[PDB]
């Protein structure tokens with residue numbers, strides 16, 4: 001079933017319940033996921049109204065872009081030309097600049113396919129918005145089906161050569177409580193390399209490093225605590241994880257990551273080459289989620305996209321988008337129960 | 347009473363009914379007025395869903411900007427520098443360029459003051475959007491009261507020197523039906539001059555013209571048909587009226603214009619210096635409003651703002667907005683019924 005109601009400030013909340021009783025909800029403010037529950041338990045982080053997002057943290061569950069991540073000095077090269085984008089983090093352009101797409105009300109239409117329900121959000125980024133050549137006609141379709149798969153499908157076409165590499169900013173916390181650290185979760189991730197950051201500004205260092213057999217190696221499932229407790233330079237730098245991991249094998253058909261807690265698992269599939277993992281390294285900020293003070297490490301993202309830093313590390317990819325060319329990207333998060341045995345204590 | 351409902355594509359329809367039983371409705375799609383009715387008759391033109399506006403005509407009732415009207419060649423100069431804005435009508439920038447603020451979903455908040463209810467719409471125009479320096483934080487407040495006064499109050503702040511001169515694009519039609527020409531309405535307007543158009547491109551011609559004692563003199567109430575049947579080259583040029591009229595006396599307290607049909611009249615007040623009057627000169631287009639095919643001359647606007655063409659005729663004013671300055675504008679449409 002599908003339900004809709006005002007979510008505040010003119011945004012709406014679209015709630016779907018599939019045949020298995022699982023419910024998931026989205027808002028057109030930032031074409032974002034607001035909640036995902038199983039048996040009354042929140043699987044992700046979210047707020048209860050639109051205003052909270054605007055006042056507390058606008059990123060959670062949002063669609064971010066046009067370019068996700070940081071671009072050093074806000075400088076990109078588009079068809080031999082240098083362009084400077086809005087700089088909202090020091091000289092850096094983070095997540096598309098200020099008052100970006102995650103802060104706008106997108107229009108939308110719901111399509112009921114029975115076993116699947118699609119919520120297609122649309123927005124036009126005008127030419128020159130935040131320094132980006134356009135216009136860019138974007139759409140993000142969020143769908144949920146009877147198989148417990150939440151899929152995000154992105155599409156875009158620009159009138160001019162530009163750059164495009166958006167992502168989905170959901171945070172998971174299988175504890176269903178922000179005040180509980182995700183160090184108790186098990187993580188499997190099919191990636192043998194990562195992109196180190198230069199320093200506190202978080203721009204890329206310039207090299208790609210092999211992480212096999214270090215505390216960041218999750219090719220074989222291990223608890224997140226292993227990473228959090230690590231004193232490896234990079235972990236200490238950011239007080240957790242806040243990095244792009246390069247997938248070893250590409251393709252929508254492969255389970256790239258799996259996050260488990262007891263009997264619940266979330267599997268990640270995508271057609272993108274990297275996954276930026278940020279573990280809510282907010283220290284004592286304590287943003288309130290459902291009246292619970294969020295803890296350091298109280299959430300984890302799996303932002304699938306082309307890795308940030310390609311400006312400096314060309315091997316990472318090319319995010320350019322040619323005029324008239326159709327962009328597409330697909331990321332899927334699937335929920336499972338008793339996929340494996342995970343019985344630990346922390 | 348206030349009622350909020352889905353208006354399509356995620357947009358909302360906010361309807362306010364005052365003590366007199368008059369109903370006015372707005373949508374956050376373009377911070378716009380959708381309907382205004384008394385005793386079951388529509389006083390303005392509007393559609394029944396968001397999709398219609400997008401498919402048929404996105405301008406009716408909307409907040410248009412950042413700059414309302416046409417800018418020759420899309421060119422403006424800011425702090426002595428040339429800037430080219432998005433061109434959406436040939437080389438001109440009309441109503442802020444393509445996919446402008448009238449096509450965006452604005453956020454909003456309703457404030458019930460009892461005798462008056464306000465709906466405050468907000469939107470951020472990012473720096474560089476359609477060529478305009480910013481970011482510009484804008485808000486438009488539409489309010490309605492028990493005295494039948496519909497007021498629009500604009501506010502904006504920019505992080506950078508830029509240009510700003512928005513307007514409200516409601517079309518009135520006291521016949522309550524689009525298939526009926528407004529030629530039968532009487533119009534009074536406190537302006538002795540107007541700004542002629544150069545040609546069919548509708549860019550300003552360059553001069554300011556005195557209209558005293560011509561078919562366009564409405565200082566004394568007159569029926570629109572007069573203007574409409576005029577042989578004035580400017581009338582002939584656009585097939586009706588599509589021009590900026592310069593108000594003789596500035597100030598919000600003065601009734602600047604009045605539109606009448608029978609027992610019903612609309613008074614216009616504004617703190618702006620000009621009113622752009624466009625009489626829906628669409629010929630056979632036949633846009634459908636409420637299933638009624640619109641006729642040529644089936645509507646009239648009162649776009650209060652600084653006259654378009656200031657790029658070429660500086661006497662008209664200056665639409666620059668310096669960084670950090672707060673822009674304000676107010677326009678009121680007051681409804682009256684003779685007893």
Ligand SMILES: OC[C@H]1O[C@@H](O)[C@H](O)[C@@H](O)[C@@H]1O
Pocket residue numbers: 059202242276278
């Ligand atoms: O929400 C703010 C956070 O956004 C994440 O996507 C970035 O990776 C973090 O470095 C940043 O602190």
Ligand SMILES: OC[C@H]1O[C@@H](O)[C@H](O)[C@@H](O)[C@@H]1O
Pocket residue numbers: 405548588624
């Ligand atoms: O909606 C399009 C119309 O907008 C009006 O404000 C302009 O004055 C007309 O020239 C134009 O045809």
Ligand code: NA
Pocket residue numbers: 010011012352353356357358
């Ligand atoms: Na809505």
